[PDB]
């Protein structure tokens with residue numbers, strides 16, 4: 001037993017490792033979207049940068065779970081980071097739809113971890129999730145939903161002018 | 175009788191209370207429009223902020239009538255603030271059309287109050303309306319009319335790209 | 349179903365709308381107290397300003413619930429804002445007693461909403477209430493209780509000098 | 523006829539001269555109150571300064587009527603400035619009551635001048651009164667009424683501690 005460990009269930013330790021892997025998986029998916037929008041035959045630079053920044057944020061989420069695991073006396077166990085579901089992402093609308101689904105998958109895993117922490121009577125882990133993860137997911141989901149609404153209004157997928165304008169006006173200029 | 179009261183007719187006092195209620199009603203309508211444009215399935219942020227700011231301005235108009243009432247020795251009497259006419263506002267064009275109508279309803283009430291103040295030979299109340307309310311209404315009505323003209327030019331309600339562009343270019347970026 | 353909605357029960361959505369209305373009701377009550385203390389026959393300016401600021405804070409509380417509703421994919425539904433219970437508030441002691449009761453009514457509604465969120469296993473809503481609402485209520489209740497103790501010490505309601513001194517020394521000079 | 527004169531009735535010219543005299547009369551009354559509160563057996567310095575400043579303001583009001591008269595092509599005609607009604611002013615409450623009455627006498631004269639200007643179809647004179655005089659009177663009357671309410675709350679005339687506290691806290695420290 002780690003000398004620091006107190007009130008930390010083995011099941012929670014394992015679930016934190018699984019959650020870490022999912023954050024890394026999400027990072028990698030976002031990195032793939034970055035590279036896609038940077039292609040010369042796609043060329044939506046601001047969209048590409050949005051996904052690159054999302055990729056970096058997910059890596060930070062993963063690192064924060066590593067630090068958490070060690071703070072509680074659990075042991076980080078890494079698994080393979082699976083490659084993303086697609087090699088090409090269609091267009092801004094398809095990519096944003098995939099991002100929404102991914103953020104909701106991540107959110108569900110966080111909510112499930114909170115259920116487990118609640119079941120094991122671990123208020124520190126509950127606090128950590130509530131204070132560092134759950135609101136970030138709600139914000140991200142809202143942002144991406146708002147984007148999808150605007151992409152549909154702009155006539156995606158068919159309206160190339162609409163897609164061009166989204167990249168100029170809806171995402172940060174990079 | 176209030177020790178400060180001088181040349182202030184009971185009818186004017188009552189009409190000021192009714193006008194206060196109408197300002198609060200207008201505030202609440204604008205708040206509803208804010209919340210509508212903030213919906214994930216509407217997502218026109220700058221339009222939402224325009225209405226939020228309008229809501230705040232109407233609350234200031236109401237507070238200024240409360241202060242006025244007390245300065246003259248009248249007594250503030252509050253009534254229920256009725257909920258807005260609609261729960262959802264369609265799109266930017268429909269909302270702006272409703273806003274134009276609301277501003278003209280408020281303006282008519284102010285003009286009617288000025289008629290009453292004139293009839294009761296209350297130059298202080300006339301001055302107050304002319305100096306603090308009537309020009310603000312004319313300016314607001316002109317601004318919203320100009321917006322409606324531009325929304326029609328942009329192809330509302332059908333042209334979603336037009337609606338997107340209005341939010342980017344016609345209202346302040348927030 | 350809203351594209352953003354996840355783990356958000358219909359009952360919680362409805363209770364958030366009811367809570368929004370109560371915040372607006374509280375705002376309106378505080379606005380009435382402001383106008384009362386601004387009367388020429390009451391004339392306790394610092395007390396009036398305390399209530400005006402409280403009114404503004406409650407409106408901010410309401411707006412934060414509107415934003416929350418939309419973040420979760422619920423839909424804001426507004427009802428009439430009922431006028432306050434009284435048209436005149438007696439004196440500083442009676443008004444502070446009414447304010448204490450109102451803050452405890454608001455607090456009970458927030459606690460009841462937290463119970464519902466707990467029952468529906470909504471940790472995001474629990475966090476929101478705990479992080480943005482519950483401590484603010486405890487602080488406000490303590491502040492107003494402290495004021496009431498001091499008003500009683502100062503001989504309210506009979507001791508007019510005591511009431512005068514409270515306005516000079518216990519509430520912020522405005 | 524003055525070369526500048528246009529739309530300026532003889533009756534209005536005369537009434538402006540009478541109003542000028544009343545402003546000077548009010549100034550002189552306030553000067554008397556200043557000297558009273560500066561007496562060693564009265565010794566309420568902040569109250570004295572309040573009245574001294576009021577005296578100066580009334581002289582400015584008079585000078586503005588002189589300038590107005592000449593701008594319109596009327597001719598300033600001065601009469602004696604009558605001494606104030608009392609040689610001693612009792613206490614802060616009695617003086618404030620006299621000040622309230624004086625401000626309402628001045629206000630009535632201004633309102634009567636506005637009636638005359640209206641009757642003679644002189645919108646410039648109406649504007650001048652509304653923009654430079656009528657709101658100043660409403661503000662002054664409200665301020666003095668608020669003071670009287672507070673003096674009564676503080677137990678005037680009998681409560682000397684109350685009178686002392688009013689001078690420290692209700693009027694500007696000089």
Ligand SMILES: [Cl-]
Pocket residue numbers: 005006007008009
């Ligand atoms: Cl343990």
Ligand SMILES: [Cl-]
Pocket residue numbers: 007
């Ligand atoms: Cl334990």
Ligand SMILES: [Cl-]
Pocket residue numbers: 008009010011
């Ligand atoms: Cl264990």
Ligand SMILES: [Cl-]
Pocket residue numbers: 013014015017018077
């Ligand atoms: Cl593991």
Ligand SMILES: [Cl-]
Pocket residue numbers: 017018021022079
């Ligand atoms: Cl794993």
Ligand SMILES: [Cl-]
Pocket residue numbers: 078079080
């Ligand atoms: Cl593996």
Ligand SMILES: [Cl-]
Pocket residue numbers: none
């Ligand atoms: Cl596998």
Ligand SMILES: [Cl-]
Pocket residue numbers: 085086098
């Ligand atoms: Cl996919």
Ligand SMILES: [Cl-]
Pocket residue numbers: 085086087088
């Ligand atoms: Cl693929």
Ligand SMILES: [Cl-]
Pocket residue numbers: 101102103105
């Ligand atoms: Cl997914």
Ligand SMILES: [Cl-]
Pocket residue numbers: 015112113114116
């Ligand atoms: Cl889990």
Ligand SMILES: [Cl-]
Pocket residue numbers: 117118121122123126
């Ligand atoms: Cl727990």
Ligand SMILES: [Cl-]
Pocket residue numbers: 130131132133134135136137
């Ligand atoms: Cl968070």
Ligand SMILES: [Cl-]
Pocket residue numbers: 139
């Ligand atoms: Cl947010």
Ligand SMILES: [Cl-]
Pocket residue numbers: 146147150170217
């Ligand atoms: Cl957007």
Ligand SMILES: [Cl-]
Pocket residue numbers: 154155156159
């Ligand atoms: Cl299209």
